[PDB]
Scaffold this active site. Structure first.
Site, PDB file in Angstrom:
ATOM      1  N   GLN A  92       0.667  -1.006   0.160  1.00 11.56           N
ATOM      2  CA  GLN A  92       0.080  -0.134   0.145  1.00 11.56           C
ATOM      3  C   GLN A  92       0.925   1.120   0.253  1.00 11.56           C
ATOM      4  OE1 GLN A  92      -1.856  -1.311   4.077  1.00 11.56           O
ATOM      5  NE2 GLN A  92      -1.815   1.194   4.000  1.00 11.56           N
ATOM      6  N   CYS A 133      -5.321   0.498   3.468  1.00 12.58           N
ATOM      7  CA  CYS A 133      -5.495  -0.782   3.839  1.00 12.58           C
ATOM      8  C   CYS A 133      -6.696  -1.193   3.531  1.00 12.58           C
ATOM      9  CB  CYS A 133      -4.881  -0.779   5.393  1.00 12.58           C
ATOM     10  SG  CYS A 133      -5.953  -0.040   6.459  1.00 12.58           S
ATOM     11  N   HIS A 173      -6.214  -1.748  11.617  1.00 10.31           N
ATOM     12  CA  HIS A 173      -5.542  -2.412  10.077  1.00 10.31           C
ATOM     13  C   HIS A 173      -6.422  -3.202   9.494  1.00 10.31           C
ATOM     14  CE1 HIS A 173      -2.646  -2.561   7.373  1.00 10.31           C
ATOM     15  NE2 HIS A 173      -2.193  -4.049   7.410  1.00 10.31           N
ATOM     16  N   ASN A 175      -1.252  -9.874   4.038  1.00  7.72           N
ATOM     17  CA  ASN A 175      -1.133  -8.328   4.610  1.00  7.72           C
ATOM     18  C   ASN A 175      -0.913  -7.456   3.178  1.00  7.72           C
ATOM     19  OD1 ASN A 175      -0.841  -6.167   6.130  1.00  7.72           O
ATOM     20  ND2 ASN A 175       1.138  -6.632   6.917  1.00  7.72           N
TER      21      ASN A 175
HETATM   22  C1  E6C Z   1      -5.170   0.944   7.770  1.00  4.80           C
HETATM   23  C2  E6C Z   1      -3.886   1.281   6.861  1.00  4.80           C
HETATM   24  O1  E6C Z   1      -2.928   1.465   7.440  1.00  4.80           O
HETATM   25  O2  E6C Z   1      -4.317   1.539   5.702  1.00  4.80           O
HETATM   26  C3  E6C Z   1      -5.728   2.231   8.260  1.00  4.80           C
HETATM   27  O3  E6C Z   1      -5.158   3.082   9.394  1.00  4.80           O
HETATM   28  C4  E6C Z   1      -7.265   2.345   8.537  1.00  4.80           C
HETATM   29  O4  E6C Z   1      -8.264   1.967   7.561  1.00  4.80           O
HETATM   30  N1  E6C Z   1      -7.372   2.027   9.549  1.00  4.80           N
HETATM   31  C5  E6C Z   1      -8.415   1.908  10.741  1.00  4.80           C
HETATM   32  C6  E6C Z   1      -7.591   2.494  11.994  1.00  4.80           C
HETATM   33  C7  E6C Z   1      -7.466   2.552  13.524  1.00  4.80           C
HETATM   34  C8  E6C Z   1      -6.685   3.453  14.188  1.00  4.80           C
HETATM   35  C9  E6C Z   1      -8.905   2.803  14.192  1.00  4.80           C
HETATM   36  C10 E6C Z   1      -9.503   3.188  10.752  1.00  4.80           C
HETATM   37  O5  E6C Z   1      -9.261   3.994  11.742  1.00  4.80           O
HETATM   38  N2  E6C Z   1     -10.418   3.474   9.892  1.00  4.80           N
HETATM   39  C11 E6C Z   1     -11.023   4.919  10.003  1.00  4.80           C
HETATM   40  C12 E6C Z   1      -9.863   5.814  10.046  1.00  4.80           C
HETATM   41  C13 E6C Z   1      -9.804   7.350  10.085  1.00  4.80           C
HETATM   42  C14 E6C Z   1     -10.716   8.100  11.199  1.00  4.80           C
HETATM   43  C15 E6C Z   1      -9.885   8.326   8.804  1.00  4.80           C
END
Ligand code: E6C
EC number: 3.4.22.2
Length: 212
Positions: free
Chosen positions: A19, A25, A159, A175
């Site tokens: 990515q 992700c 993730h 992954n």
């Molecule tokens: C995964 C990646 O590294 O691409 C990516 O961070 C993701 O979509 N993650 C979730 C992350 C956690 C910290 C909860 C996610 O948060 N989904 C929504 C994220 C934001 C508030 C924009």
């Protein structure tokens, strides 16, 4: 369901992607599932566009994170293009679907796997690759070099990945950090420890596409 499952062996998984430095992700994960279900349903293995999801799923936040369920809802409502038509650029740009011609494939719906239940997830996996989330922020997860990963790790999911198989004591995950991470870009996560969250909270939120 069999004791061992590996969609990679059924020719239902395409090569491992990177990515890059874009929080995409969620797109990556959704595509692993679409790729799988099509092979399963049609007999062809195609690569689909993650970029298309990144640019067009306005409910998600591009390189800032997103929702596989949202991405998947998008593919069911509208459809998606082949990866070569709409290649990955690792940056969000305008949605170019119409610019690119008719969609390569469309799904019929999206379903959620009943959470915090290992048996339900294994069942689904036995059926097709599934979108799953886990906590990847800890250093242990990040420096994973192979073997059965067992933590240490909390259940602060952040993730999105895809479950492509299972065995007696692990769940096989694909992954999107490149082939240089873990087991050629895959991770075998310890299963059956009785933790309802699943290791790294692997059972919090899982989805898969529906294709008639
Ligand atoms: C995964 C990646 O590294 O691409 C990516 O961070 C993701 O979509 N993650 C979730 C992350 C956690 C910290 C909860 C996610 O948060 N989904 C929504 C994220 C934001 C508030 C924009």
């Amino acid at each position: 369901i069999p004791e061992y499952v590996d969609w990679r062996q059924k020719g239902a998984v395409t090569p491992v992607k990177n990515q890059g430095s874009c929080g995409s992700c969620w797109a990556f994960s959704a595509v692993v599932t679409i790729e799988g279900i099509i092979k399963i349903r049609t007999g062809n293995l195609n690569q689909y566009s993650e970029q298309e999801l990144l640019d067009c799923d306005r409910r998600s936040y591009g390189c800032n994170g997103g929702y596989p369920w949202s991405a998947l809802q998008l593919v069911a409502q509208y459809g998606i293009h082949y990866r070569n038509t709409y290649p990955y650029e690792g940056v969000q740009r305008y949605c170019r679907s119409r610019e690119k011609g008719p969609y390569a494939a469309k799904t019929d719906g999206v379903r959620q796997v009943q959470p915090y239940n290992q048996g339900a997830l294994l069942y689904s996996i036995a059926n097709q690759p599934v979108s799953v989330v886990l906590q990847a922020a800890g250093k242990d997860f990040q420096l994973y070099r192979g073997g059965i990963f067992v933590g240490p790790c909390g259940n602060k999911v952040d993730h999105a990945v895809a479950a492509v198989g299972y065995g007696p004591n692990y769940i096989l995950i694909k992954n999107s950090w490149g082939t240089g991470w873990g087991e050629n870009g895959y991770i075998r996560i310890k299963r059956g420890t009785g933790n309802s969250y699943g290791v790294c909270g692997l059972y919090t939120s899982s989805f898969y596409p529906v294709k008639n």
